[PDB]
Every structure is written in structure tokens, then in C-alpha cells.
Design a protein around this ligand. Sequence first.
Ligand SMILES: *[C@@H]1O[C@H](CO)[C@@H](O[C@@H]2O[C@H](CO)[C@@H](O[C@@H]3O[C@H](CO[C@H]4O[C@H](CO[C@H]5O[C@H](CO)[C@@H](O)[C@H](O)[C@@H]5O)[C@@H](O)[C@H](O[C@H]5O[C@H](CO)[C@@H](O)[C@H](O)[C@@H]5O[C@H]5O[C@H](CO)[C@@H](O)[C@H](O)[C@@H]5O)[C@@H]4O)[C@@H](O)[C@H](O[C@H]4O[C@H](CO)[C@@H](O)[C@H](O)[C@@H]4O[C@H]4O[C@H](CO)[C@@H](O)[C@H](O)[C@@H]4O)[C@@H]3O)[C@H](O)[C@H]2NC(C)=O)[C@H](O)[C@H]1NC(C)=O
Ligand SMILES: CSc1ccc(C(=O)c2c(Cl)cc(Cl)cc2Cl)cc1Cc1ccc(=O)[nH]n1
Ligand SMILES: [Ca+2]
Ligand SMILES: [Cl-]
Ligand SMILES: [K+]
Ligand SMILES: [Zn+2]
Length: 804
Amino acid sequence: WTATSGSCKGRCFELQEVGPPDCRCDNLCKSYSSCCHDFDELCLKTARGWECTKDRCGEVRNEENACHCSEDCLSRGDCCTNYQVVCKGESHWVDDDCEEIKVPECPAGFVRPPLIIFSVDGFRASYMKKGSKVMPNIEKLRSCGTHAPYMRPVYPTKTFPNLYTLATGLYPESHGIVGNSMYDPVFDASFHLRGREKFNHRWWGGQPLWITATKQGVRAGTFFWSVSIPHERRILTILQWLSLPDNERPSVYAFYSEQPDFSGHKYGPFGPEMTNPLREIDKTVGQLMDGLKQLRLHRCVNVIFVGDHGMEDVTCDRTEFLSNYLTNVDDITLVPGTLGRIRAKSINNSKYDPKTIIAALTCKKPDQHFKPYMKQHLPKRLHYANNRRIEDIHLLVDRRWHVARKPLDVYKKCFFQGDHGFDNKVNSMQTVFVGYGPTFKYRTKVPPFENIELYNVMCDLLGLKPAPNNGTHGSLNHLLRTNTFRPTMPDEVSRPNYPGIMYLQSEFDLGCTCDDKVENKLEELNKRLHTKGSTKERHLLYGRPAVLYRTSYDILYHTDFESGYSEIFLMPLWTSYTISKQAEVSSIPEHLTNCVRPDVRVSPGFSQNCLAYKNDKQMSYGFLFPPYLSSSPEAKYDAFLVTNMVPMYPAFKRVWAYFQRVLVKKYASERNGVNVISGPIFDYNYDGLRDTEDEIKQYVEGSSIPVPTHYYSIITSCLDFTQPADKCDGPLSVSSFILPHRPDNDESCNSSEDESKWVEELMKMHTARVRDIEHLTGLDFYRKTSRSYSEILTLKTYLHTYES
Ligand SMILES: *[C@@H]1O[C@H](CO)[C@@H](O[C@@H]2O[C@H](CO)[C@@H](O[C@@H]3O[C@H](CO[C@H]4O[C@H](CO[C@H]5O[C@H](CO)[C@@H](O)[C@H](O)[C@@H]5O)[C@@H](O)[C@H](O[C@H]5O[C@H](CO)[C@@H](O)[C@H](O)[C@@H]5O[C@H]5O[C@H](CO)[C@@H](O)[C@H](O)[C@@H]5O)[C@@H]4O)[C@@H](O)[C@H](O[C@H]4O[C@H](CO)[C@@H](O)[C@H](O)[C@@H]4O[C@H]4O[C@H](CO)[C@@H](O)[C@H](O)[C@@H]4O)[C@@H]3O)[C@H](O)[C@H]2NC(C)=O)[C@H](O)[C@H]1NC(C)=O
Ligand SMILES: CSc1ccc(C(=O)c2c(Cl)cc(Cl)cc2Cl)cc1Cc1ccc(=O)[nH]n1
Ligand SMILES: [Ca+2]
Ligand SMILES: [Cl-]
Ligand SMILES: [K+]
Ligand SMILES: [Zn+2]
């Protein structure tokens, strides 16, 4: 109960939330059902509309009006946005040529340029070009400011998870807003777009920008707008707050639009009905820019025009029904739509079996427009596992499709022609970024980047120190005219040993055999030089990766490759090698098929052994530097060292071998040489961070050899591919992946065919950023290059998406 009988007189859109049951006049009151009796009358005036006309100029002030054309309105902070255009012969912002904003041009009392986040729901990236004719204000922002061709949302590509990511720099798995709809098993509560539950603070983790600012003495406008407050009233409230006295004025503001999303759902992303909502968004941008020009703030404020996700064509008849696949369909709860999440209908039911559910959903129809996953097997790039509100069973739905439990759910629980939510690499889910202002660059295009990076940049823009987040601070420095944040490489924590030859062969009892006793003053000196790192400049092109945690490891040099060998994990943390465009593929000689050789640099005690592999009927082994790519038959012996060996399921060995035998060589051909860094990853608790030794859940039978959950590779070349990778003067080009190390290939429905019909497809699905690899390994790459550190950070956040 609210004593809703107090008044909003004087307090319209007050910035501090008053405590109950003293009635409210802020933005959230409509939704809390707690507005004072007179809120509508005083605070949501509409009389005379939103525009000045000739006959209103120099009028006598009438307080009932929605906005004002009286002579006193500039001082009072409440003119209609077009006031000066109509009554003072001024021009609209959009009709002024753009001029570089070299320095902030702010009124006295502004301690820093304000930041305005103009946020648009469902604004697909291609609207910038396709809708350009009807969006002149937005097109001016875009061409005069800094813009990306598109911005990558987070998964799922829904509204709430993406807005809260914008505000916190965090993956949904970390901030808690894992879907537009969610069920928490501990709260026994469901969170929904509609209703009151969403307002409880227990759902909302991390630290959003308005709180970061408040805690560091920067005041903030509301980010949440009530649906029922019209857009012209949100613009006018922002411009009013901007006329408050210096001690009361916020430095950060947000404007939110439910369009074009709302129409996109009804009409599809390019329906003819979509032209008008783009015109309307444009007009709102013109209002804000006209209002800012009135207050002399249009060369002082930094504006961000940003979307939360795009919009795809999705209709009723493109629905897959779980009832066509399962028979026990009434035992599950499905969160339906452009993604699937499945859990038991009852927790008091012990019969429920995820393995049986997954099995009934895998490769059952030729055309199947979804693919089931245990959450921990989803591509690592989606970062969508480490939260109790994310169900163990996930369905990645094909773009343009929906998943539903039963047909009754679709005709009784067509209406819609668009939707979003799909994998965040899908073109049609991409969205927009433009920054315009004194702190942004002038007329600059930047590469596509992810929305998890903006929190750091908005903190920079406001002189704030960011709460810890998943952005890579520095990676967007190239957006900004003037920096504030100077990144530095993390310090190496463990330094390597460099062992020489310390062990005689007979000290090893590893149960290994090799046919290698088939053996000069010229090339006895050479192989000794190789073992001391003579070729190391060739194979380690960017310096050794730094180990950022406490551990014990050895650098091992060879003719063809270099490695960092973990004495703790009994295998390399990283193996580095260069394959030039000219290099040849050869095969494993018959006599060397089961060859594994003890490494005289590394004790028996810190080595793997062949016997464990013999005994483990599930687990075989592969090599990190491939024998196939040896530079000489003599160099090929180095690849069979026990220290180059790693545990691999035979199912996995199919993928791995195809990558090593066919794809490295193809990439080296196409890219003019490639450098490859490969290694294992341990993430048993699926938190996207490297596992400590005591977190490992699986070992090769009867040994201390831990089993990787994933295998990575980082493949680097020269962006100017007329230069060879090993002699590149300028910017680098990278693609990487993190392959799940799985004992079957159930993920790939064509896996019974030749590897050439399915392996590359899998590897594309599991494309990764270097930065994802870094979190997963505790390593830091590219420490010695000629590139600036900012550029290197951009490079480490790059994701190769394989879309067209
Ligand atoms: C993406 O970026 C983020 C942010 O950097 C990374 O996420 C961070 O990861 C850290 C390492 O895993 C993790 O550290 C934990 O945190 C434990 C403390 O937990 C609470 O406190 C957090 C701080 O809030 C305050 O922040 C500022 C200062 O920064 C203050 O001024 C304010 O006062 C703030 O309140 C808070 O963030 C955190 O929020 C989570 O939980 C909330 C409610 O439950 C949710 O609403 C919210 O969404 C967060 O939930 C996420 O994270 C949790 C795990 O924290 C996860 O389970 C969820 O699914 C979800 O993903 C909490 O409220 C701290 O106690 C931990 O310490 C243990 O381990 C260390 C190891 O060194 C030991 O030394 C230590 O003693 C302790 O061990 C003990 O406990 C063990 C397990 O409980 C037990 O086994 C053992 O025996 C011991 O008893 C540890 O430091 C951060 O909390 C986490 N932050 C967030 C927001 O997620 C993330 O990794 C990045 N992702 C990638 C891929 O890189
Ligand atoms: C830059 S606009 C922006 C940024 C972040 C957030 C939020 O984090 C948020 C909050 Cl604070 C409360 C709730 Cl219930 C849900 C969300 Cl997603 C909200 C908005 C705007 C908005 C969103 C939806 C809406 O109805 N009204 N306004
Ligand atoms: Ca982990
Ligand atoms: Cl959802
Ligand atoms: K075996
Ligand atoms: Zn939507």
C-alpha cells in the first residue's frame, strides 16, 4: 500500500527515489503502481503537442503546455525542441555542415562533457545503409562521428541480456540476465518481460554504469524508462535535467526506444511497414540534437547511438516441435523460441534423464533446424554456461526458425513475422554503433567490435574507473580522440626453465617404443644448435607467451617447433610453429607409426607414458606439432617425443588429424604462411577460466595425465598477405578456435562421411577470440611484436565469424 495522496508539485522526474509509502514521481512509479495522484497532470503534460508553430512564438507562458515557445523558455529549460528554428530563424542540427569537434565546447560549470546513450531496440546493422534515405539525422551522426559497420551483441541476442551487458560490460552468464524469460532453481521464481518479478534486485548482478558513476561522485539520469512515457517526453526530461544547476545536473543520461524492434516483430525486419518507425527514430534523434543546439551543448555532449540486437524473418510455419521427437514430452519444461532451454517438469522426479533427452534430439531428421547441447559443450565463444539459471540442456536454433514444445503452444498458449535471440555470430542479429562528440574521432570507421567492450569506454568517457568486467580495456582506444586509459601487459608470474640433456634413455620406463636407432660432423653441430633455439626466430614470431600463474614449466626447442612444457600437467601448455606457403606435407613412415620417444631433457617423473594409453581403452593420443609437417625425415623424430604428446579420444583424433594434415597447409597457402600456436585447455567447471590442478575430473586411466576438455589453435599471418607470415612489417591477421575434446562426433550429423564434408564446419562453429583462449589458459600472447599494445588488444578481441 502507498499513501499515493502526497504530490508531484515541483518533483517531476525527480532523480532520487523517495522511500515508501511516501508517493513517487520518478520513472519507475508507473511500474510500481506508486505515482502520486497528480503525476499524470503535472508530469505528463501533452497540451499543444511537441512542436512550436509561428503563432506560438513569444507567447505568454501557459504551464499546462507540453513544451513552451515563450521568451522565458530557454532560461527555464523547457522550450519545444524546435523553438529556435521556428521563433529565432535558427537551422535544424541536421542541416548544418559538420565541423570537427577538436575540443569540448561547453558552457561554464560543465566539469566534463556529458554522455548520452541513445539506445534503440532491434536496430539491425544493415538499416544504416538500407534505411539511409529516411534517416538523415542518424546518417549525419554516423558519417561525422566514429562508427563501426556493425556491433556484435551477446548471446542470447534478446533485449534484456543485451541492455544489461551494455550497462555492466559482463556476459549474461556473469550478470544473471540470461534470457528475456528465466527460471531460477534456487529462488523457485520465474522472471518475465511482463510483471513485477523483474524489478527485484536479486536478479541483477555485476555493477551497472549508473552505480559505478554514483559511487565515484558522477551523478546519473534514470536508465529505465516506463513504456507509457512517450519519446518526446523522455527527450524533454533529458534536456531539462541538462539545465539543472551544476551541483544537481547528472553527467550520464540514457534514452531508450522500443522501436524498431516492436514493429520488426510484427512485420519482419524489412517489411514495408518498417519505413515509418525508422523515420520516427530519426525524428527523435533530430529533436535531441536540436534541443542540445539550443542549450549550446551540441559540441559538448558525447552521444552514443547503439542497438541491442538485430531482427530476423521468423514465421509460425518455421517451427520445430519437440513432440515430433520425444514421446515423454510432458515430463519437460521448454523455454521456447529462437533458442531452446529444457529442464525437468518436476525436481522430485529422479527418473528424468538428460542423456536420453539429448539422444532423442540428435540428428533425427535430415532437415533438423535445431541442435541439442549440454550447456558445457556449447561453443566457448558464447560464454553461456556458468549460471544456475541456464538449463543443462540447450538448443541452438537455426536462423529463421523457432522451437516449440507442442503444436498447442503455438496456436493456443500467424501473429509475428520477425524475431531475434539466435547465435550472436548470425548477420541478421548484428546491430549498430555510432559515437559522436569531442571525445570520439572525426569521420572515422572502426572495425566491428562486441558490445561487452562499451562499459570500459563509457567509464573512460566519464573519467570513471570501471568495475571488473569482460571487456578488454584498451581494445577500443582507437574509437577515441583523447584516451585516459593506457593499457600495459600483465607481468609474467612464472619464468621457464631451459633444460639441457639430463637423462639417459635407460632411465625411462614408459612402456614406449620407437624404431629410431637407424643413425656426422656437419649436422651433429646443427641439431645441437636447434635444441638450443637457433631456429627459434622462425617458429616463435611474437615472443614466448607469458604464463600468468604460479607453475613449473620448461621451454623446449626443436628444428620445427618450440614448446612450453608443463611439469604439472605433463604436457605442453603451448606449442608454436610456422608453416610457410612453400612447406610440404609428408606422411608418417610405416616404421614410425606407433613411435613415441622419451625426451632426455625431461625426467621420467614429469613425462607421460605409453602404458597408460595402452590400458585406457577409451583414450588414445595425438601430437601438438604434427609429424606431417616436419621439415626433414630427420626432423620428423622430434615430433614423436613424449613431450609433444597429448591425450585424445579416437573420435577427436579424426578432427585433429584432418586439421593438421589438410587445413594448416591450406591456410598457409591462402594466407602466405601461417604461424600456429596450439595446446590443451582444462575447464571442467565450465567457467571459461583455466582450471587449477585440483579441479581436473578426468585422467588417462591409472595415471596422473589430465584429460583436456578442449584443444585450441591460434593461427596468425600478415594482414598484407603479399608479405610472408615470417617477414611481416605491419598489422597481423588472426583466426583461432577452441575445439571441444569429445569422445564422439554426435555434434556433427555428417560425421560418418569424409572429414572434408564436416570437420571445417565444426571448426567454424567453434571459432574463438585470442582473449577467450587467454582466460582459458592463463597465458598472454603477442608479447613481442612491433605493433602498439592497443592494436594488439584489438587483435586479441577479434573473432573470425565465417559469415558473408
Ligand atoms: C567476466 O568478468 C567477471 C567479473 O570480473 C568475472 O567474474 C568474476 O569471477 C571471479 C572468479 O571466479 C569471482 O570471484 C569470486 O567471487 C566470490 C565473491 O562473490 C560475491 O562478490 C562479488 C563482489 O561484489 C562487489 O564488488 C565490488 C568490488 O568489486 C564491491 O565494492 C561491492 O560491495 C560489490 O557487492 C560479486 O560480483 C559476486 O556476484 C555473483 O553472485 C551474485 C549473487 O550470488 C550474482 O547476482 C552475480 O550475477 C554473480 O554471479 C556470477 O558469479 C558467481 C561466482 O561469484 C557464479 O557462481 C554465478 O553463476 C555468476 O556467473 C558475489 O556476490 C568470492 O567469494 C570467490 O572467492 C573464492 O575463491 C577464491 C579463489 O582464489 C578463494 O581465494 C576464496 O577464498 C574463495 O574460496 C571459498 O569459496 C569457494 C567457492 O565458493 C569454496 O570452494 C572454498 O572452499 C572457499 O570457502 C571469488 O573471488 C567474481 O565474483 C566474479 N564476478 C562476477 C560478477 O561474476 C568472470 O570470470 C569473467 N568471465 C570470463 C570468461 O573471463
Ligand atoms: C540505455 S537504455 C537501458 C539500459 C539498461 C537497462 C537495464 O539495465 C534495465 C533496467 Cl535498469 C530495468 C529493467 Cl526492468 C530492465 C532493464 Cl534491461 C534499461 C534501459 C532502458 C529500458 C529498458 C527496458 C524498458 O522497459 N525501459 N527502459
Ligand atoms: Ca574453469
Ligand atoms: Cl529467453
Ligand atoms: K587407448
Ligand atoms: Zn524483440
